[PDB]
Chain A
Amino acid sequence: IAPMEKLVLAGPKGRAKELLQSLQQAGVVHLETLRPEALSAYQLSPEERAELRRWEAVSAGAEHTLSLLGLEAEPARPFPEGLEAAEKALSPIQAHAEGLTRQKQELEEELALAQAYLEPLERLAALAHGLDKSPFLRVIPFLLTEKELPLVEEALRKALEDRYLLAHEAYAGGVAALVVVHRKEVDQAKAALSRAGVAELRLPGALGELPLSEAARRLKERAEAAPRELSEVRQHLAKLARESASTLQSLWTRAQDEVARLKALEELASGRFGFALLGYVPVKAKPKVEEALARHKESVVYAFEPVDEHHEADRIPVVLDNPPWAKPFELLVSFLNTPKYGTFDPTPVVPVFFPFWFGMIVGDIGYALLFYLVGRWLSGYVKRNEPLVIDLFALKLKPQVIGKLVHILNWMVFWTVVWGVIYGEFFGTFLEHLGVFGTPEHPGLIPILIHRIDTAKTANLLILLSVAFGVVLVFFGLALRAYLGLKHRHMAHFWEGVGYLGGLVGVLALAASYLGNLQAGWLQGLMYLGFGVFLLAVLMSRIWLMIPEIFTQAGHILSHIRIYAVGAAGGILAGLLTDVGFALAERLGLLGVLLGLLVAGVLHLLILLLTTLGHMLQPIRLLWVEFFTKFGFYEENGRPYRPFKSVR
C-alpha cells in the first residue's frame, strides 16, 4: 500500500500545455478534474478541438491501415514530426493498400463467381451456338437438378411440343436445362416452369448480363487472368507491409501520444489565461516528479500535498507497494478488485500460506520434476523474449507475466518438493520398487514422517493440521478486521470482528469439550466467556448479524480440511495407479515393464492434467474465500492508479 500523496501544478494555458507534455513524458502521476469551484471547464479551443479530431482521425486511419495490412498494434518509439507531413506520409501507403485490397477482394470475388459457373456456361453456349442472341428465340437456361427432365418438360409439352428446343447436354454438377422457343410464349412458358420450379442463369456483374458467347469469352479471360493477378497483388501487399509497417507503427505511437495529450487537456481547469492541474502520485516518485518539474518553464509550483486521512479517500488511487521477494504474486493479488486505500494489503499472506497449503496439496516429487521441466521450457521461451501465444486459448502473454509465473512456480515447487519429501512420494509410488520411505511393514530406507498410504495413524493428525491452519488463518483475518476497524475508528466492524472471534473461540471450546475429549473443567469458563462475549457484542452492535453469520464463519473456518482431503485423494489415486502399473509390470511377467511403464506414465500424465488444475486452484480459492472475506475486502473496489501513459 503506497502513500499516494496529492500533486498539483499551475501556470498559464500554453505553459500548462508544455508542462502537461512534460508530465506525459514522465507519466508517473494520475490526474484529477477539480472543475467545480471558481474556475472554467477548460474547453481549450475550437481550433484545439479540430486539431485533436484531426490527430484522432490520423490515429484511426493508421489503425485501419494496420488492420488492412494484417499487422497488429505493436508499440514502438514515436515519429516526431508535424501533423501535415505525417498525414501525407500515412495517406500514400493507406491509399496504396486500400486500392490493393479492393482490387484483391474484387478479383477474388470475380474468380469465385467465374469458377462457380465455368464449365456449365461453356456447355450451354456450345449447345446454344446457333441462336445465342437471335431476335426470334429466347433461350431460358437453367442449372437444374438431376435426371427428372420430364418434370420440367411437362411445361414444354404444354407449349408447342415439336418446337422449343429444350434439353440438358452434359456437366452433371448441374444439368444445363436449356429451353429455346420464342420471346412471348417462351416467357409465359418460363413463368410456368418457374411455377413448376426453375430459374434462369442470371448471374451478377456482366456474365449474367451480356450475350452468351461474349460472356463466355470474358469469363474464360478472367479465369485465365485472375490467379497471377492475385499472386502479384499478395506479393505487392507483402512488400508494402514490409516496407511501411515500422513507419506506420511509429506514426501510431506518436498519434496515440498526441491524442493522449489532447484528451488529457480536457481534464484541465482554466483560469482566464491561467491553468492548473491536480492529481495523485506515489511518495516513492516524489524525486522523479521533482526531476520532471525541473524541466518546467519557471519551475512551477509542484505542490506535494499529503493524501487524505482514514476517512474520505474515495478518488485516491491504489498501488501494491510490496516486497520484491513478494512482487511475483501481484497478478494473483490483482485478479480481484482493489482495497479501500487504508485496508490491509493481504498479498503477503498469499505467499506465506498458498505455497504452504499447495505443497500439502500436491506431494508428488515426480510431478515437481515435471513442473521443473515445464518451468525450464517456459524460462527458455521467456529468454527467447517472444510473446507467449496460444491461439486456441487466445492467450497472448508478455515476458514479465511469464517470468512472474516462472518465479511463482519455482517458489511453489521448492515447498512442493519439501512436502513430497515429507509425504515420501515421488511420481506416485516409486517406493514400491525401491523403498525410499522406511516403513515397519517393509524397511527399505530412512523412515517417512507420513507414509501417505494408510490413514489409521495419519488421518486424525492431518485433519488436526488442516483445522489448526484454518483456525489460525481465520483468527488472523478477524484480528486484521478488528485492527482495521480500530484504525478507521468505525467501532461497528471492530465490535463485529471481536464478537466473531469470541464466538468462534467459544464454539471451538464447547465443541472440543462436548464432542471432543474429557476434562471439561479448564475450558468451561472459556466457553461461557465466549458465549457471553458473543452476546455482549451482539448487544453492543444490534446489527442482527445473527447465528447464521457465526455458523457461516465457523464453516469458513472448518472448510480448511478440504486441502487434506484433496491431498489424500490425489495421493490415493497416484498410489493406486503406480501400484497397479508396477504390479502388472513386474509381478505380471517382469518383461512388459517397458509397455506397462509407458501406459502407467500415460495414465499418470492424464490424471495429472485432469486433476492438477483443480488441486492448485482449490488452495488459492480457499485463500480468496477465507482471508479476504473474513477481513472484508468487498467494499467499494478501490480506484486504480492510472498515470499518463506514454505507451512507447
Chain B
Amino acid sequence: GGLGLIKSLAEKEKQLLERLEAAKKEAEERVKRAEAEAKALLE
C-alpha cells in the first residue's frame, strides 16, 4: 500500500546510498595506496 511504499522507498534510498558511500570510501583507500606506491617507486 501507500505507507508500505513510503517505508520501502525510505529503506531503499537509505541502503543504496549507504552502499554508495561505502564503495567510495574504499575508492579513497585505493587512491591513497596508489600514490603511496607511486612515491615509493619514485624514491
Interface residues of A (CB under 8 A from B): 6, 8, 10, 34, 37-39, 269, 271-274, 276, 278, 303, 305
Chain B at the A interface: SS class: helix
Q: Is B42 an interface residue (CB 8 A)?
A: no
Nearest Cβ on chain B to A342's Cβ, whole angstroms? 20
A272-B17 CB under 8 A given contacts A10-B9, A38-B9, A38-B10: yes
A37 / chain B contacts, CB cutoff of 8 Å: 3, 6
Shortest Cβ distance from B13 into A: residue:
A272
10 A-B contacts (beta carbon < 8 Å): A6-B1, A34-B2, A34-B6, A37-B6, A38-B10, A39-B6, A271-B10, A272-B12, A272-B16, A276-B5
B12 / chain A contacts, CB cutoff of 8 Å: 271-272, 274
**A589-B16 Cα distance, complex, nearest whole Å:** 103
Q: Is B7 an interface residue (CB 8 A)?
A: yes
User: What is the interface size of chain B, counting residues whose CB is below 8 A from a CB of the partner?
Assistant: 12
**A97-B5 Cα distance, complex, nearest whole Å:** 51
A278 / chain B contacts, CB cutoff of 8 Å: 2, 5
Shortest Cβ distance from B17 into A: residue:
A272
Inter-subunit contact A305/B2 (CB<8 Å): yes
Inter-subunit contact B2/A8 (CB<8 Å): yes
Nearest Cβ on chain A to B10's Cβ, whole angstroms? 4
Other A-B pairs beyond A8-B2, A271-B13, A276-B9, 7, CB < 8 Å: A8-B1, A8-B5, A38-B6, A271-B9, A273-B13, A274-B12, A303-B1
Shortest Cβ distance from B3 into A: residue:
A37
Q: Which 7 A-B pairs have the closest CB atoms?
A: A271-B9, A38-B10, A272-B13, A305-B1, A37-B6, A276-B5, A278-B2
Which of B2, B10, B12 has the most CB atoms of chain A within a 10 A radius of its CB? Answer: B2
Nearest Cβ on chain A to B13's Cβ, whole angstroms? 4
**A274-B12 Cα distance, complex, nearest whole Å:** 8
Shortest Cβ distance from A303 into B: residue:
B1
Nearest Cβ on chain A to B5's Cβ, whole angstroms? 5
Shortest Cβ distance from B12 into A: residue:
A274
**A300-B1 Cα distance, complex, nearest whole Å:** 13
Shortest Cβ distance from B5 into A: residue:
A276
Shortest Cβ distance from A34 into B: residue:
B2
Inter-subunit contact B2/A39 (CB<8 Å): no
A10 / chain B contacts, CB cutoff of 8 Å: 5, 9
Nearest Cβ on chain A to B14's Cβ, whole angstroms? 9
**A245-B5 Cα distance, complex, nearest whole Å:** 46
Nearest Cβ on chain A to B18's Cβ, whole angstroms? 12
B10 / chain A contacts, CB cutoff of 8 Å: 38-39, 271
Nearest Cβ on chain A to B4's Cβ, whole angstroms? 8
Which of A8, A271, A273, A303 has the most CB atoms of chain B within a 10 A radius of its CB? Answer: A271
Query: Could you give, for residues 13-28 of chain B, a 1 whenever the CB lies within 8 Å of some chain A CB and a 0 otherwise?
Result: 1001100000000000
Nearest Cβ on chain A to B43's Cβ, whole angstroms? 44
